[PDB]
Amino acid sequence: EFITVARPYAKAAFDFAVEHQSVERWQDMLAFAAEVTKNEQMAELLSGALAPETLAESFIAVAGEQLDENGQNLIRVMAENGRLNALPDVLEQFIHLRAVSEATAEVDVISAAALSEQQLAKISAAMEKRLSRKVKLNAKIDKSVMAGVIIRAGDMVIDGSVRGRLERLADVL
Amino acid sequence: NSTEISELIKQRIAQFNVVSEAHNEGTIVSVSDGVIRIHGLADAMQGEMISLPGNRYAIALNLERDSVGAVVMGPYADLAEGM
Amino acid sequence: TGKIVQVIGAVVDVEFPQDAVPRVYDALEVQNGNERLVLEVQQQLGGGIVRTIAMGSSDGLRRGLDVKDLEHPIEVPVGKATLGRIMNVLGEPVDMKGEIGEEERWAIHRAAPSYEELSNSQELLETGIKVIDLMAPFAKGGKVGLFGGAGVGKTVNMMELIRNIAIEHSGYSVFAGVGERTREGNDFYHEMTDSNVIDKVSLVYGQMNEPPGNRLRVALTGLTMAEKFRDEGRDVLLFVDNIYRYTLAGTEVSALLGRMPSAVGYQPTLAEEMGVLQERITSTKTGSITSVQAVYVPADDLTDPSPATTFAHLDATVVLSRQIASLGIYPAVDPLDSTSRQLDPLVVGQEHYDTARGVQSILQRYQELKDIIAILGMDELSEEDKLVVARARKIQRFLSQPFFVAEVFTGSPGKYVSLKDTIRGFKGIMEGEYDHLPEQAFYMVGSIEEAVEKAKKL
Amino acid sequence: MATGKIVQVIGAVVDVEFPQDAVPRVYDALEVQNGNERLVLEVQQQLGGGIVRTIAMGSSDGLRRGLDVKDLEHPIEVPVGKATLGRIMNVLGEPVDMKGEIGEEER
Ligand SMILES: Nc1ncnc2c1ncn2[C@@H]1O[C@H](COP(=O)(O)OP(=O)(O)OP(=O)(O)O)[C@@H](O)[C@H]1O
Ligand SMILES: [Mg+2]
């Protein structure tokens, strides 16, 4: 998957967007450049052997919205190195860098029932203590959880489910 | 604003006439030592005879994700990229 | 549900929805023109791509074909319904008879029996063949391997062992044709039908004709039938027509599976792939498998990885030499390289053990003299060294034997030799009881009585 | 008019980019100014994207990236016939004796 080759570009675009105070636009800009990449006929062209420049200028034409001389030049760089199919992974990494820089985390919370909201006030206040970041909740109701709740944040998990605790107990043959 | 962007793209591709090859048809991408790499041929099958310009064939040995690998049943040296 | 996305030789990549990706070793199915092709799943790549081997010809496959996900491994008929019929790797009937009256089907991929289940046995099994049960005798429930190069006698020897063992034995038998000649499958089938012994034998054939994927899996189809008869509590004979072809079909696909080459270009998994097959061919406290395997030796190189790995798996090993076979001594067994776990004074007893070690000592000493003799000639030897040579040459000739299956070649009638006659015979030669007979007297005579009758007419 | 540009030079192996609709066929001969002498290149492979790969028929030293390349549309062509007799030539058919030009009729 493209993640490893997308990292160098994602940093440079975010760094540049910080200097020029344009991070929001750049996000909405990369969101278009990723989406044109997903179109079928455009995809065929990208898998083709068109020389970089001829590929780039035919891409840039479709990406009309792109800020000329900044967003459009970022395409020319990626076209020299044939990374254009990585654009969906150059985005999202840009969003990750942004969320780190804005000291903000999406955190997820999965339970047998819709949580009581008052509980979510406690959970968010706890997560803002566990991690020194503002925490957006987007919790879920799930049938698999017999009772209780899972808290998931980045790649750290705190299982509070009865499902997990039974299958944690069933372990001791 | 997603369904709009998708539609806009579809309109803009046409406005610029960028479009696929026909099935059963393709182009030579690279040429070396009698091995041929072809882009397109979305309907080619393993072991098919691919007719080249002139009156000669290549045999499809590999159907890669992006290309067909083929070997030329004759002189190869006159073939060129983009045939 | 799936889509084909690459076709490289025998290997096909299929994409599935990420909620639905097939397990490893699942069977998939795809329509290829006017026939159905099965694919077996080997690896899960990322992103719902899965990489598979075609159980049939992959020519005519397009990209973008729809693939059906069967929820199970390759499963084959087992039990008495298979007896007397010829079946394919997929467990399909290949004789022109009707469908197989299966009651049960078993997945060809299985775990070996646990360490607690295994059983020991020391019951010596007799053979017709002077050299084999003298030099490398073997037990009921053990494994035998015939190692040799191209054209040395692996099949003819296995056909005598079938004739001798599998007709004085009373239970069922399984013969697995793995990457060998189709003519020899047909020749075998008939003489089984002409002898009316066919109804005790299940036969599975995956000959060289077939595409890689068939030659790879067909050995496991054969074991899975033999494991049903063993677990039923029977005593079973399993014959494998060439085990080397299983490893070679692994070599052919391994690069297309994307695995770095090892050693002499073998797959890196060679020892695990061989071991996971070999560990299933074991006798157990519930029931027994006696096994004979032919083992082709590429370029006669016994130090090649594929032979070298096979040697640790087996209880008796008989090594066939092109250098002997070009003398026309048959069976072309090398007694200085052939060996068995059963050549032990406790199981064989002392007379047999002493006779075998005497023969081994004289023939070794003859190898030590041959480099002197080649440059100097024999006249320079000592008068005891000349007696060692004069005996060793008689020993080499007396290891020769007429075979009932070989009558079509030599014309001469075959011989079955009791173990007692072999020990008595070789013990007499080494003691010098026969030092007055010519060498020609010993070549191709069944028993030592037959040497002295041949000597009267020279 | 030269239409290619050199894009790599790794010892004797020289890669040249052409416009996509102009790629040399295999064994075609190119030439370039290696300073103050013309150097011939023979085409070995057509790679993707208009890039071609060539072996230099002379010393590779002193080539820059970005030099212009003339695509002679034939293979290497050599003089033939009676005019060649008693003359020494190199592989390019150029006289290696000092004895002036070869009075060729055909190449
Ligand atoms: N005991 C024997 N008596 C006479 N001839 C023999 C004997 N054993 C082998 N031969 C000769 O060698 C030939 C080949 O033997 P066989 O087919 O068993 O070889 P193989 O080891 O199976 O070779 P391959 O690896 O090709 O299958 C026989 O056809 C016969 O000509
Ligand atoms: Mg054989």
GROMACS .gro file of C-alpha atoms in nm, chain D:
model
  107
  715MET     CA    1   1.692   1.892  -3.584
  716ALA     CA    2   1.784   1.692  -3.275
  717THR     CA    3   1.481   1.562  -3.088
  718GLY     CA    4   1.608   1.364  -2.787
  719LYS     CA    5   1.781   1.458  -2.465
  720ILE     CA    6   2.022   1.250  -2.256
  721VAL     CA    7   1.874   1.162  -1.917
  722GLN     CA    8   2.126   0.916  -1.769
  723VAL     CA    9   2.488   0.825  -1.827
  724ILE     CA   10   2.614   0.521  -1.636
  725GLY     CA   11   2.941   0.415  -1.793
  726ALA     CA   12   2.882   0.299  -2.149
  727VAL     CA   13   2.503   0.283  -2.101
  728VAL     CA   14   2.329   0.603  -2.209
  729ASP     CA   15   1.955   0.666  -2.171
  730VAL     CA   16   1.781   0.916  -2.398
  731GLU     CA   17   1.429   1.056  -2.377
  732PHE     CA   18   1.239   1.124  -2.700
  733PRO     CA   19   0.893   1.265  -2.765
  734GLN     CA   20   0.648   0.976  -2.741
  735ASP     CA   21   0.551   0.983  -3.107
  736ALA     CA   22   0.914   0.964  -3.223
  737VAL     CA   23   1.080   0.676  -3.036
  738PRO     CA   24   1.367   0.505  -3.225
  739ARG     CA   25   1.324   0.145  -3.325
  740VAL     CA   26   1.566  -0.116  -3.191
  741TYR     CA   27   1.919  -0.111  -3.334
  742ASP     CA   28   1.866   0.243  -3.469
  743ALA     CA   29   2.174   0.468  -3.454
  744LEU     CA   30   2.172   0.804  -3.271
  745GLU     CA   31   2.442   1.071  -3.263
  746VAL     CA   32   2.547   1.348  -3.019
  747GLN     CA   33   2.820   1.612  -2.988
  748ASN     CA   34   3.065   1.487  -2.726
  749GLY     CA   35   3.223   1.832  -2.723
  750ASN     CA   36   3.409   1.857  -3.053
  751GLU     CA   37   3.342   1.511  -3.202
  752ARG     CA   38   3.020   1.327  -3.290
  753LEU     CA   39   2.951   1.014  -3.083
  754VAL     CA   40   2.722   0.738  -3.219
  755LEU     CA   41   2.481   0.547  -2.989
  756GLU     CA   42   2.311   0.217  -3.079
  757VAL     CA   43   1.960   0.150  -2.940
  758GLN     CA   44   1.919  -0.168  -2.731
  759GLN     CA   45   1.577  -0.133  -2.560
  760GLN     CA   46   1.269   0.083  -2.573
  761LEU     CA   47   1.167   0.153  -2.216
  762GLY     CA   48   0.837   0.306  -2.115
  763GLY     CA   49   0.762   0.674  -2.159
  764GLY     CA   50   0.972   0.762  -2.459
  765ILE     CA   51   1.294   0.660  -2.290
  766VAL     CA   52   1.530   0.451  -2.497
  767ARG     CA   53   1.844   0.272  -2.380
  768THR     CA   54   2.166   0.270  -2.581
  769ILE     CA   55   2.530   0.161  -2.586
  770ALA     CA   56   2.789   0.422  -2.679
  771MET     CA   57   3.002   0.340  -2.986
  772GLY     CA   58   3.290   0.542  -2.844
  773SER     CA   59   3.412   0.705  -2.527
  774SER     CA   60   3.130   0.803  -2.290
  775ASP     CA   61   3.341   1.053  -2.093
  776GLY     CA   62   3.235   1.415  -2.109
  777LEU     CA   63   2.867   1.353  -2.175
  778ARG     CA   64   2.630   1.576  -1.979
  779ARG     CA   65   2.270   1.519  -1.893
  780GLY     CA   66   2.049   1.726  -2.122
  781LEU     CA   67   2.260   1.710  -2.439
  782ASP     CA   68   2.061   1.709  -2.763
  783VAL     CA   69   2.040   1.382  -2.958
  784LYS     CA   70   1.988   1.339  -3.334
  785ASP     CA   71   1.786   1.032  -3.435
  786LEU     CA   72   1.933   0.891  -3.754
  787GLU     CA   73   1.647   0.671  -3.859
  788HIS     CA   74   1.856   0.381  -3.994
  789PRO     CA   75   2.086   0.132  -3.823
  790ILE     CA   76   2.461   0.174  -3.838
  791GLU     CA   77   2.541   0.197  -4.209
  792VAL     CA   78   2.880   0.111  -4.357
  793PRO     CA   79   3.045   0.158  -4.699
  794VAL     CA   80   3.068  -0.151  -4.920
  795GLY     CA   81   3.218  -0.273  -5.245
  796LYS     CA   82   3.542  -0.233  -5.436
  797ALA     CA   83   3.628   0.098  -5.268
  798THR     CA   84   3.679  -0.089  -4.936
  799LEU     CA   85   3.959  -0.314  -5.065
  800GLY     CA   86   4.298  -0.240  -4.911
  801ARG     CA   87   4.149   0.003  -4.656
  802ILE     CA   88   4.130  -0.030  -4.277
  803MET     CA   89   3.806   0.076  -4.110
  804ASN     CA   90   3.656   0.086  -3.763
  805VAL     CA   91   3.316  -0.063  -3.673
  806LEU     CA   92   3.149   0.256  -3.795
  807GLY     CA   93   3.313   0.216  -4.133
  808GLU     CA   94   3.535   0.520  -4.085
  809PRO     CA   95   3.893   0.492  -4.215
  810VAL     CA   96   4.150   0.412  -3.947
  811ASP     CA   97   4.440   0.438  -4.188
  812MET     CA   98   4.535   0.792  -4.280
  813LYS     CA   99   4.459   0.733  -4.647
  814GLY     CA  100   4.169   0.979  -4.687
  815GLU     CA  101   3.799   0.926  -4.748
  816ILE     CA  102   3.660   0.602  -4.892
  817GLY     CA  103   3.508   0.649  -5.238
  818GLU     CA  104   3.186   0.470  -5.140
  819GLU     CA  105   2.902   0.403  -5.384
  820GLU     CA  106   2.655   0.254  -5.134
  821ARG     CA  107   2.616   0.220  -4.761
   0.00000   0.00000   0.00000
